[PDB]
Design a protein around this ligand. Structure first.
Ligand SMILES: *[C@@H]1O[C@H](CO)[C@@H](O[C@@H]2O[C@H](CO)[C@@H](O[C@@H]3O[C@H](CO)[C@@H](O)[C@H](O)[C@@H]3O)[C@H](O)[C@H]2NC(C)=O)[C@H](O)[C@H]1NC(C)=O
Ligand SMILES: *[C@@H]1O[C@H](CO)[C@@H](O[C@@H]2O[C@H](CO)[C@@H](O[C@@H]3O[C@H](CO)[C@@H](O)[C@H](O)[C@@H]3O)[C@H](O)[C@H]2NC(C)=O)[C@H](O)[C@H]1NC(C)=O
Ligand SMILES: *[C@@H]1O[C@H](CO)[C@@H](O[C@@H]2O[C@H](CO)[C@@H](O[C@@H]3O[C@H](CO)[C@@H](O)[C@H](O)[C@@H]3O)[C@H](O)[C@H]2NC(C)=O)[C@H](O)[C@H]1NC(C)=O
Ligand SMILES: *[C@@H]1O[C@H](CO)[C@@H](O[C@@H]2O[C@H](CO)[C@@H](O[C@@H]3O[C@H](CO)[C@@H](O)[C@H](O)[C@@H]3O)[C@H](O)[C@H]2NC(C)=O)[C@H](O)[C@H]1NC(C)=O
Ligand SMILES: *[C@@H]1O[C@H](CO)[C@@H](O[C@@H]2O[C@H](CO)[C@@H](O)[C@H](O)[C@H]2NC(C)=O)[C@H](O)[C@H]1NC(C)=O
Ligand SMILES: *[C@@H]1O[C@H](CO)[C@@H](O[C@@H]2O[C@H](CO)[C@@H](O)[C@H](O)[C@H]2NC(C)=O)[C@H](O)[C@H]1NC(C)=O
Ligand SMILES: *[C@@H]1O[C@H](CO)[C@@H](O[C@@H]2O[C@H](CO)[C@@H](O)[C@H](O)[C@H]2NC(C)=O)[C@H](O)[C@H]1NC(C)=O
Ligand SMILES: *[C@@H]1O[C@H](CO)[C@@H](O[C@@H]2O[C@H](CO)[C@@H](O)[C@H](O)[C@H]2NC(C)=O)[C@H](O)[C@H]1NC(C)=O
Ligand SMILES: [Ca+2]
Ligand SMILES: [Ca+2]
Ligand SMILES: [Ca+2]
Ligand SMILES: [Ca+2]
Lengths: 394, 394, 394, 394
C-alpha cells in the first residue's frame, strides 16, 4: 500500500453521468435504514463510500421524531459503499459527529468528526479506525467543517473548518494532517467574507474549494491553498449566482473579491460546489432561486476568472418539482480510471420530510451521484421517490 | 490478477443440473427483499453473482405498488452472490439502470446500466466500481441491452445493444470494451430482422448470441461475432420454434435466414437462450406456446445448421402449472472447473404477481440456475413457491 | 493454499466442552431467521461453519406452515459461521438440497446436495462454489446422504450415500472425490444391515463412520473405509444401545456383527455419532429410550471391540425435560490447534414445534456444539430456549 | 503476522476524547439488536471490537422479558466492530458465556467464556475461533472473570479470575496463556481483600489491574503482575474513593493496603477502571455516590502511591441525570498510532430498563468509548438516548 499522489490536473469534462442512487428512503419504508443528512462521498484508490450523519434513529421508528436538536450527543458519522442505502446492517461506524469530513490517503481512511457542546466542541481525528488527534474549538462558537470529502495529496490530508457566528464575521482555518496527526494549520484572513461547508477537490497539487457564504453573499466563496497552507481567498467571479437563496441571473452582477447579496438573500445559503475548468467553471445550483428544489449544473465560460454571464452548457439532474438539498464535490483517483487526470464528481442530497413536508414528523435525505465525462450527457430527473407520509407519521 | 482468456471451446453437455435457487419471494414474505426482475447470472474467475433490476422497493411494502413505469429514475442494477436472495443487506449496488448487462474480465467486474429519458437515454459503464465511459442513444428510442451476462475474452468485454422501435425495424450494435472504455463498435445490418435481449456466451474465441425477435419472428435471431466485431446474423435454423408466443412445432417450418411468424405470434416475445453444440443446439423455451409458463430445454440434432425437427433430448425444469419468465445464458470459466472447455449454464426467471396474478399489486421474480454436465440429468419442477396474495395485497 | 493432510490419529479425550450455541429460534422470534433442520458443522483449516437445510421460509412467517413435504423443490443447503443464527442476511447459499453433506479439503469448500423427484433424484457436487459433478440415484428410491460433515484427507473427500427402502434392505455406497469430481465409488455389502445418515470422521488416515439403522437395529452400524474404498462394516460392539428408539441397557445384549432390535424399536432411529478411542468409544444418545429428548455422551470401556457394558464416563449436555434431535460428528484440523491429533467434536440439534409441540404450525431446530478436551468437563443443560407458541401460531 | 510486543509504557494523557457511541438501544427500537450487558472493548493490531454478553434475545421481543437468570444456558459472548450496534446480522459469535474476557495477541483473537452450573462452571478458551483449552472452577462457587479486555504481551495473554463468595473472602487467580493454551497460573493471596471484574492494561511489560471489591471496600483493589505471575496486590492509594456505592470524598480516608468501607457501602460495587500515570492516576467513577448514574474521570496527583486528595483534572462524560453502569479499560497498540507508548482508553456502559426503570420488562445497555490524548479535552454528556418504555413494555 502506498500514498496516493493525487497531484494530477483535474479533468476537463463536457458532461456529468449518473453513477449511483441509493433509494434509501424508499427502502426505509420497510427496511432498517437510518434517518440521515449529508450523504457525502469520498473515494480511496479502489473504493468510493457514502458517508452520512445520523441521530442513530431509523426510518418509521419513533426515535426519528424531530424532537432532538441537530447537534446532539447521539449524532454519528457512518459510511456504506457508494450506492448502498444507509442501513443498519451495512453501515460502518466512523466517528461521533454532528459535523464531519472524511477522505482516503491511499493507505487508510481519515475521518474527522466534531462533537461536544456549542461553546466547547472538538473534532476527533480517526485514522485507519483509530483515534489519533483532536482539534479544539478556538472561538468557542460551534466548531464546524465541510460536510463533504477532504483532500489527500502525497500522504497529507487537508480540510477547512469554521468557528464563530452563523450570520456575521467568523473565523476560518485550514488544516494539514499526516496519518491522522495535525501537522500544520493556518487562519484564513477574509474580512467581510464568510466561509461554511466547503466543497474541496485536488487540482494540479493544490486544493480548490467552493464554499457557502451564510452572511452577505449569494455568490460562493472560493478558497485555494497549497501544501504550505499558503492561500488565495475570494468569490466565484461568475456573473451567475449559485447559492440559495439568490436573485435571478439578470439582477446579479458578479465579483471576484466581494460578497454580493441583499434583496432578501442575506443570512442563509446552502452547501454547494464548483469545478475549475481552466478559466471556466462547472457550478451546481438549485433550480429555484428561493428554495432547495431542483438541481442543475452550469458550465460558465471564463467564470473562474471574470464576471462572465456566458453559460455554454447546462444540465438538469432534478426538476424543480422535487426537493434537493446539499451538494458536494469529490474526485476519482487515477488508480481506477484509465486517465492522467482526476475525475470531478458531485453528490446531490434530496431532503424529505420537515421542514417542507410538515405532515411528517421526521427529516431524512437520499442521494444521487454524478461524475464528469469527456462528452456531453443528457439530463433527466432522478428524484428521491419516497411516498410520504410514512407509517410513523400516522 | 490476470485477464481471463475465455477462448476455449464451449463444453458439449448431455444434461443440465440445478445449481441454485434463491427463494427470494418466499423469504421476502417476512425478510427485507427487493422486488426485482431479470435475475441474470455472471461469473468471474472465482465467483458467480446474481444481478437484478429493482425499483428500490421491498416486498410487502407500499412502494412495491405497480404505480411506476418500468423505466423510472428509481430503477437500479444490484447483485448478490449466486443463490442469495436479492435482499436489502447483502445487495451490492452496481449501476443506475432500467436496462443492463454485466460480466467479469478476470480482474474486475464490468457493469453497463442504462438510464435517462426514452428519447435520450445513455449507458454508464462501471469498471471495478468506477464510472469509466458512456454510450449515448443513437436512435433516441429506448436504448436497451441484454438483461444478461456480457462476454469477456482476453481482457476485452463485448455486449449487444438495440435502439429503435419495439415492433418494427430497429438498429442493433455490438460493442467492444477494455477496462471499461469502449474501444470499438459496429452496427449490425439485419433488414427484416429484430434483435432484443441477447443471451451471449463465448465459444472458441467468438461470441455467440441467441436473441429475441419482437417483430415478425417466433424463431430466435442468432448473432455471432469476433474480436474485430465482424459478424454473422440470421435465425436459429431449427424447425422447432423457441420464442413465446409461438405455434405448435408441427405448424412451424424453420429458416436459417428469415423471421418466421404470423399466426398471432407477431409483436411479442420473451428473452431466452441457446447453446451451440457443434452442429446441434440446446435451446430453452416455455412449455406453453402462448404464455410464460413452464420451462424445458431441448437438444435439437443439427439444429444450428439446418431446419431440423429431430429432438434428441428434452428436460423439463418447471412444469406448465407454474409461471416462468426470462431466461439467459452464461458460462463458468476454466479457473474453477477441472475442464478444458467452458461450461454452459442458464438462469430461469419465475415471475409472480402482475400481470398474471391480478390480486397482487406488485410484480417480482425469483430464479433457478442450471449448468451443463457431461451426463444426462433428470428434470423436476423447481417452482418459485411463494404463497400469494401477500400481506400488502390486503 | 494447500490440501489438509488430515491423516493424524484422532485425539483421546476425557470430556467435551461447549463451543457454541446459536440461539436461532429465540432470535427468530423477532429477527429474520430460517426455519431449519440438521445444523451440522464442518471445519476448514481456519474456519468452522454451521450448515443447515431450509425450505426458504422464515420463523414467524406464513411460509413456515408445515404444508410442504420435506423433499420439496424449495429445500436448500446454506451455511453461516459456527455459532451464528441461521439468518437471512449472514447465510451463504451452498446447494439446492433436501439431503446433504459438506466438508473442506484445505483449499476449498465441498458441498453435496441432493434434489429432484424421489424416483430419480441426483446429487450436485459444488466445489469452491462451482458445480463440478453429479451423482445419480442408482436404485431410484430417495437417494440420500449423511446430513453431516464429509471427510477430506490428502486432497480427497469422501462420503456415504444410501438408495432404497427406509425400513428394509437398501443399497449403500461410499464415494471418493478430488476437487469436486467423483474419482471412485464402491457399494458396501451389508446384507441384513441398514445404513442411514452416517456421522464420519478421519482417524489415522481412515474414515470411521457411526450410522443409523432404520430397519432391525437399535445398535448403530459402524463403517470404516480407506482411500481405496476398501471397507469393514458391522455394528458398534458395545452392550449399550445408542439409537432411539431403544430398550433399557439391562435388556440389551450387544453384537459386533448383527443388528439387534425388536421390542418395539424396529423401523425407526435417529442420526447420531460415536468416536473410537483406541479400543473404547465415546457414544452419544438421547436420554430417553423412546423419544428424542435429552442428550448424553458415554465413554464405554472397550466398546469398539467387544460387547462391553462398562460405562467409565457419562456427561449430560441436555436434560430429559428438553427436546433434542439429530447429532453428528466432525473434527478440528491441526492447522488451528496446538495438537498432533484431530480433535473430535459433535453438534446437537434441538427440535422445536411439530411433531412434539402440536400448538405450533412449524418445525425448526437450534444447535449446541461441543469439542473433546484432554480433561474431564462437567455437564449442564443447554436447551433451545425459545418460548412457544410463536406469533404465527396464533 | 507477528505477535504484538505491547511492552511499551502507557501514554501519559491530559484528557479523554470520545471515539464511539453505538446508539444500540435507540436503533433497537425498530432494528434487530440484542439485549446486552458489558459492551467491553478490545483491540488487535488493526481493529478494535465491542464484545458483549446477550441472552440471545432481541430488543422489543418477548424473549427480552427478564424472566431468566443472568447465568443461563442461553448467555453468549459476541462481538461487532467498535461503534457498531450489537445487532443480529453484524454480530460475530465468540463463546458460550455468562462471564467473559477477550483480547488479541497480534495474530489471533482470544476469547474466554464461562458457562455451566454455579457449583461446577468452566471457562472455554477460544483462539482464532477454535476451542483450545478449559479452566475448571476450583472453589465451585461461580467461577467468573473480568468482563473486559484481557492483556497480551509478547505472544502471551493474561487474565484474572475469581471463584468463591460474592460478599466475603473468595479466591483470586491470574492466568497466562499462549495460543489459547493455559501455560501458567497463580493464586493471589489477598486476605481481607476482594477482587472482582478487573480492568487491566499493559504498562511497561507488566499487567496493571484496577478491580471491584464487593466485600468491605469502597476503594478499588489494585493488582499488578508480570510474565512470571509474580504479583503485588493492594488498594488504590488515593484518598478519593471510586467504587459505587461510596461516601462523599470528605468522609473518606485512603489506604494503599486495606479495604476502606462501612457507612452503608459494604457488599456491593460496580466494575470500574483506572490508569497509572507515573505516580498519579486517572480514575473513573459514577457521579452519584450511591447509584449508577453519571460518569466522570479524575486525575489524582500522586494517587497511585499515596492517600492524596488532590484532584488536578476532572472531566464529566455523562451527567448525573442519566444512567451509567460498568466501565472498563483497554489500550490501543503502537501498530496503528504514531506513538511509542500505549494509548489508554475506556468504555462506559449505560444501562436502560430494570432495575431503575421498572415500567420496562427488559434490561439492556449501550456504550460510549473514550481514548486518552496529549491535551485537555472538554467533557459533555453523551447519554444512551433511548425513549422508554418500548413497544414490548405495553
Ligand atoms: C412526535 O412528537 C410529537 C410531539 O411530542 C408527539 O405529538 C404529541 O404526542 C402527545 C402524546 O400522544 C400528544 O399529547 C396528548 O394528546 C392527547 C389528546 O388529547 C391527550 O389525551 C394526552 O394527554 C396528551 O396530551 C400531543 O397531542 C401530540 N401532538 C403535539 C404535542 O403536537 C408525537 O406523538 C410523536 N410521535 C411519535 C411517533 O413518537
Ligand atoms: C396501490 O395503488 C392503488 C391505486 O392507487 C391503491 O388503490 C386505491 O387506493 C385509494 C386510496 O385508498 C382508494 O381511493 C379511496 O377509496 C375509498 C373508498 O371509497 C375512498 O374513501 C377514498 O376517498 C379514496 O377514493 C382506491 O379505491 C384504491 N383502488 C383503486 C384506485 O383502484 C392502493 O391503495 C395502493 N396500495 C398500497 C399498499 O399502497
Ligand atoms: C397453516 O395451514 C393451515 C392448514 O391449511 C391453516 O389452517 C386453516 O386455515 C384455513 C383458512 O383460514 C381455515 O379455513 C377456514 O375456516 C373458517 C372458519 O370456519 C372459514 O370461514 C373459512 O371458509 C375456511 O374454511 C381452516 O379452518 C384452518 N385450519 C385447518 C385447515 O385445520 C392455517 O391458516 C395456516 N397458517 C398460516 C399462518 O398460514
Ligand atoms: C413478561 O413476563 C411477565 C411475567 O410473567 C408477564 O406478565 C404476566 O403475563 C401473564 C400472561 O398474560 C398475566 O397473567 C394473566 O392475567 C390475566 C388478567 O387477569 C388473566 O386473564 C390470565 O389468566 C393471566 O393470569 C399476568 O397478569 C402478567 N403480569 C404479572 C405476572 O405480573 C408478561 O406478559 C411478559 N411480557 C411479555 C411481552 O412476554
Ligand atoms: C483543461 O483545459 C484547460 C484550458 O484549455 C487547459 O489549460 C491549458 O493548457 C495549455 C497546455 O498546457 C496551456 O497552454 C494553456 O495556457 C492552458 N489554459 C489555461 C486557461 O490554463 C488544460 O490543459 C486542460 N486540462 C486537462 C487535464 O486536459
Ligand atoms: C463438441 O462436439 C462437436 C461435434 O462432435 C465437436 O466438433 C468436432 O470436433 C472434431 C475434432 O476436432 C472435428 O473433427 C469435427 O469436424 C467437429 N465437428 C463439428 C460439427 O464441429 C467438438 O470437438 C466438441 N467440443 C468439445 C469441447 O469436446
Ligand atoms: C489413544 O489411546 C489409545 C489406547 O491407549 C492409544 O493406542 C495405543 O498406542 C500405543 C502406542 O502406540 C500402542 O502400543 C497400543 O497398542 C495402542 N492401543 C490401542 C488399543 O490401539 C493411542 O496412541 C492414543 N492416541 C493418541 C493420539 O494419543
Ligand atoms: C509519564 O510520566 C511519568 C512521570 O513524570 C514519567 O516517569 C518519569 O520518567 C523519567 C524519565 O525516565 C524518570 O526520570 C522519572 O523517575 C519517572 N517518574 C516516575 C514517577 O516514574 C514517564 O516517563 C511518562 N511516560 C511517558 C510514556 O512519557
Ligand atoms: Ca448566502
Ligand atoms: Ca417474437
Ligand atoms: Ca433403529
Ligand atoms: Ca465495594
Amino acid at each position: 500500500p502506498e500514498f496516493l499522489n493525487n497531484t494530477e490536473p483535474l479533468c476537463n469534462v463536457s458532461g456529468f453521468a449518473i453513477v449511483s442512487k441509493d433509494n434509501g428512503i424508499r427502502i426505509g419504508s420497510r427496511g432498517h435504514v437510518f434517518v440521515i443528512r449529508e450523504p457525502f462521498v469520498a473515494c480511496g484508490p479502489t473504493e468510493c463510500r457514502t458517508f452520512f450523519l445520523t441521530q442513530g434513529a431509523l426510518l418509521n421508528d419513533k426515535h426519528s421524531n424531530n424532537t432532538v436538536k441537530d447537534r446532539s450527543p447521539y449524532r454519528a458519522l457512518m459510511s456504506v459503499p457508494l450506492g448502498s442505502s444507509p442501513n443498519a446492517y451495512q453501515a460502518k461506524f466512523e466517528s461521533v459527529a454532528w459535523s464531519a469530513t472524511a477522505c482516503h490517503d491511499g493507505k487508510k481512511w481519515l475521518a474527522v468528526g466534531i462533537s461536544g457542546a456549542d461553546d466547547d466542541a472538538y473534532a476527533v481525528i480517526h485514522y485507519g479506525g483509530m483515534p489519533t488527534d483532536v482539534v479544539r474549538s478556538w472561538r468557542k462558537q460551534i466548531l464546524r467543517t465541510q460536510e463533504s470529502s477532504c483532500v489527500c495529496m502525497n500522504g497529507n490530508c487537508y480540510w477547512v473548518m469554521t468557528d464563530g457566528p452563523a450570520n456575521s464575521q467568523a473565523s476560518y482555518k485550514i488544516f494539514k494532517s499526516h496519518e491522522g496527526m495535525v501537522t500544520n494549520e493556518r487562519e484564513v484572513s477574509f474580512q467581510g467574507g464568510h466561509i461554511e461547508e466547503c466543497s474541496c477537490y485536488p487540482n494540479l497539487g493544490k486544493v480548490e474549494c467552493v464554499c457557502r457564504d451564510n452572511w452577505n453573499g449569494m455568490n460562493r466563496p472560493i478558497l485555494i491553498f497549497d501544501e504550505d497552507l499558503d492561500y488565495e481567498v475570494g468569490y466565484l467571479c461568475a456573473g451567475i449566482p449559485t447559492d440559495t437563496p439568490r436573485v435571478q441571473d439578470s439582477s446579479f452582477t458578479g465579483s471576484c473579491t466581494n460578497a454580493v447579496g441583499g434583496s432578501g438573500t442575506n443570512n442563509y445559503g446552502v452547501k454547494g460546489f464548483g469545478f475549475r475548468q481552466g478559466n471556466s467553471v462547472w457550478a451546481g445550483r438549485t433550480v429555484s432561486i428561493s428554495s432547495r428544489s431542483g438541481f442543475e449544473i452550469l458550465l460558465i465560460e471564463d467564470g473562474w476568472i471574470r464576471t462572465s454571464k456566458t453559460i455554454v452548457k447546462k444540465v438538469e439532474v432534478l426538476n424543480n418539482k422535487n426537493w434537493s438539498g446539499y451538494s458536494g464535490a469529490f474526485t476519482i483517483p487515477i488508480t481506477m480510471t484509465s486517465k492522467q487526470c482526476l475525475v470531478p464528481c458531485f453528490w446531490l442530497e434530496m431532503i424529505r420530510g420537515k421542514p417542507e413536508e410538515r405532515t411528517s414528523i421526521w427529516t431524512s435525505s437520499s442521494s444521487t451521484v454524478f461524475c464528469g465525462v469527456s462528452s456531453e450527457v443528457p439530463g433527466w430527473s432522478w428524484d428521491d421517490g419516497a411516498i410520504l407520509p410514512f407509517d410513523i407519521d400516522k
